[PDB]
């Protein structure tokens, strides 16, 4: 499981929207929310109900907010900018793998080099931002501590204290329906509703034989659970020969889903 | 009817803030059929992110279709093919543009002062040399004390003896300005440079 | 770069007429982050609509979930209307109950 | 298929040296196989001339021939901007095709030649680059060569003429000599031939100071 | 015509055909050749009537001395060019005396049939607009007293020599009238060609005109050339309508004739 | 640079059958100076032919006069044959008595 922070700063935010905001994730569940308007890191979902930990996260995110907003001054341009950062960590023998990547206007352009302890990239914008960040007192030092020690220590703390939240399981409610589509064809849709870990496999069978997986879509629900649907094109009048099988951690055995 | 596919600007591909775009121009389009269909393909995969300008009318309707590309996709030599389609064309015309294949070479930048013979004239010429680069797509600019200079003309890239390219930038400054000790820098940008950017300073010794 | 949004419309639980449920509009894969989303009930904009935090995927493209509590009926039609810089006109995606 | 005509002007070095022969070359491509005969009519300022030497119709790999007609011109006639028109005539061509080549109109400008030594940064490398600058000339037709101790150098590449801010042209010649050869104090000269400079020839010397 | 010129026509070739001279000169007093010189014989000699004219003691030896030094210069010019290919160097040196004392010098040179160098009398140096002029002029400038002798030859020696020959002028005042003939040829179906020919005349200045019924009918297409004795030949032809030839006449004006001469077809 | 020769053929005095005269072949306006000239009597090359000095005109082009003593007759035909670098084949110009 990975602990990852999704940081974003915009040079010209839309009225009433924050210039900087963060979302923290523990695997597929969001545990943290932060924005420059409120200025405080807050828990999300189940983590609201789970010490002097949130004040420290607030202190650190306010420091990253200043770094992000300072990056736009280093670029110095009238046009709008969007700066994104993905910082976090994930281990065979209690090891940690850091992640420290950045994107400008939707394109990856910078990373934090843990060997040199500096921000680097192959672009002039990376050179400009890295230089400005290197001259901020203890910024490189705090960035190294955050990835190499603070992140794995926080990740281990959340795995120990919030184990139950991370081991959440809910099987999907299934439905299989057909629609007319092309003249000599129909479209069968197998849909999975409100399921807890997002890992799910939907397969189609024709007379019990493998018929592949069609074109699918995936998305979340308001409670952090998920929704998925896969559709397959079949010959008109042959729909009754098809079945849909779902495999999910909430189910003990694969489930066969029948058509109406 | 004829089709011409242009590659993006070199400065646009070296700066993420800039937008690099592959321009497809369609000339000789008949007035009998003004509709021109455009199909964009990156490595065979069709893309719908292209923005097509209206058919501006010569009998040739200049129907232009531009496509914004990823900086890392163009630098990794991805092939961008545009397929045009019209009733006047018996077969659909297709053009393909890609980054110049070959291992990139880090250019060396050397600033040269004006000759002792030229110091007679009212305007001296500050020379700059960019040697050994690949591909030929490069961008060279001049600046003095933060404020950039406008009186510079840069020679096109010329093929060198070792298979690489060389280039020269000639900035024409006033003799009095050079004698005052002003520091003139030449900023050069290329795919094979560290951070795509480098600038060498030049002033009186 | 600018990336056009992908729009998905689905209910939280299997739809059953007369039963309380949630209608979702999941908008993903767009850039820049500025976006306008509205949920429609028979063409009329729904007032009580909440949304998740604006987050982003591995490819840096943004995603957002809009949702509202609703009770579907046989005659009621629902849709999601999205506007973005990449869209010439607002894209309307009707809710397909299947 | 439509036959095409291309009229080429003489070489710049050929027009500056009397010993050399300057020639206006007329190349006729896309000539039909049905009719291989190609009539050539040369006119200098409207007056028909007959001192042209037409090369034979050589068959190309395309099923067309390359009928070339060359005319040797006077050095003082070409330098005074005389108009040379070439009228091609064949049964395949409905109307006789006509091309006209003349010296680039405009008052000639005497180019200034400045030799620049290699930068201190480059003195690290095994091979240094001796730069030469030819600025303020007109027309673009020029010839630049390098030589050392009488024997000419072959490791030079000269940039094409670039249009300058003042309406004139500029050019650069880059000779790549070995670092050891430059350090030995060898004198490298850049010779440049152009219409507007005295005696059509000038050479600036360059060595270690 | 009150201006007569003394002109030397010098030629040097880098690869002369076997048995032919590498350098040769012809000297002219107006339209008559008075001098001949070639590198094979190595001596300046009189030509035509000038062979029989009694000249000052040492005249021809001095001309030989001067032409031998020019022979060395012209051959030196090829060494300055330094090329395997063949060269032809020509020079036209002399002066022309007008009605007054004003002598006008001529000093021009050509390489491979194209004019390129001249001797600049203001600077006292050979100059031009070509790299071959720079090369040759420099080599000639380094030859002891070559420029000094060239300048004195044009400004002092030439007018003095010319004035002496004009004073000592029986050969130059030769006037031989042309023998005339007018004949017609058939030509195009409805046309004929009339040719008026002038034989063995001197001086070369001659005017041939056609008249139709006594009215001016112009001058047709003509040709001119010399005879072996230094006299000249000329012929002009005019296209006329077939059957109309008998209406034409030809008039000749020449210094050997006191009045213009009418020439009839006389086809008889 | 290279100029093709102009050839003129005429007698020194008006032609009269049985009377001694000179036949001239005047070659002018050529470059380079190397040239070959022959006088012909009924197609046969004439042996006793003299020539003037090779000289040149204001345009630097060369000129030369070839001549031979002859006695014209009614049946005798004369011509001049010239060869030069500029000529693909020797040019033969027949003597026109009227000119
Ligand atoms: C079938 O094939 C033949 C080709 O033959 C063979 O084909 C294949 C199968 C192979 O085997 C191949 O190896 C063979 O060669 C086709 O013929 C070709 O036709 C095209 C036209 O479609 C010609 O293209 C034009 O070329 C011009 C430049 O030509 C020079 O450079 C190329 C190389 O880049 C050479 O190939 C050429 O020979 C030219 O090179 C010059 O040659 C001169 C002598 O010929 C040299 O000068 C003389 O040299 C001697 C000796 O040294 C003396 O010194 C003399 O004193 C000296 O003068 C010269 O040094 C040498 N230079 C160089 C660098 O090599 C282009 O300029 C031209 O562009 C015009 O046309 C375009 C198309 O229309 C247009 O888009 C352009 O904008 C441009 O337009 C012109 O613009 C100007 C300014 O506005 C106007 O004034 C013009 O009017 C205007 N023109 C037009 C028409 O609009 C062309 O690109 C091609 O060159 C020719 N090949 C050859 C060998 O000649 C044939 O067409 C095929 N048949 C069919 C049916 O398909
Ligand atoms: C009506 O009028 C317009 C123009 O008139 C204008 O408007 C009027 C109203 C007036 O104001 C007037 O003054 C204006 O000019 C006319 O349209 C023109 O058509 C031309 C067609 O030849 C076209 O010319 C091309 O120009 C290219 C340069 O582009 C510059 O200009 C444009 C302008 O819009 C700019 O955007 C651009 O930034 C540039 O500044 C030039 O490059 C083209 O050359 C190629 O084609 C020539 C033959 O036509 C040929 O001779 C050249 O050598 C060259 O050939 C190409 O070579 C390369 C390399 O070998 C090949 O590429 C390789 O291909 C492989 C395989 O696919 C691989 O991909 C490699 O990577 C790749 O490098 C290429 O395939 C070769 N092509 C061919 C065909 O062989 C060309 O000269 C003009 O730009 C047009 N004008 C405009 C404004 O766009 C209409 O045609 C007129 N209508 C009628 C009915 O006449």
Author numbering:
A (entry chain C): 5 to 54, 58 to 97, 99 to 268
B (entry chain F): 238 to 294, 297 to 444
C (entry chain D): 1 to 98
D (entry chain E): 236 to 444
E (entry chain A): 2 to 169, 171 to 270
F (entry chain B): 1 to 99
Which sentences did the original study use to describe this structure?
Binding to the neonatal Fc receptor (FcRn) extends serum half-life of IgG, and antagonizing this interaction is a promising therapeutic approach in IgG-mediated autoimmune diseases. To gain insights into the binding mode of the Abdegs to FcRn, we determined the crystal structure of Fc-MST-HN, both alone and in complex with FcRn.
Overall, the crystal structure of Fc-MST-HN in complex with FcRn:β2M superimposes very well to that of FcRn:β2M in complex with Fc-MST (Cα RMSD of 0.62 Å using 380 atoms). In both complexes, the Fc is bound by FcRn in an 2:1 molar ratio and in an upside-down fashion (i.e., with the CH2 domains oriented towards the membrane-proximal region of FcRn). Our structural analysis established that while Fc-MST-HN retains all interaction epitopes on FcRn compared to Fc-MST, it introduces a novel interaction site centered around F434 in Fc-MST-HN, which exploits a hitherto unaddressed hydrophobic cavity in FcRn. Indeed, our crystallographic model showing the architecture of the Fc-MST-HN in complex with FcRn, confirms that although Fc molecules can bind FcRn in a 2:1 stoichiometry, a similar architecture involving whole antibodies would result in a steric clash between the membrane and the Fab arms. The crystal structure of Fc-MST-HN in complex with FcRn provides a plausible explanation why the Fab disrupts the interaction only in the context of membrane-associated FcRn.
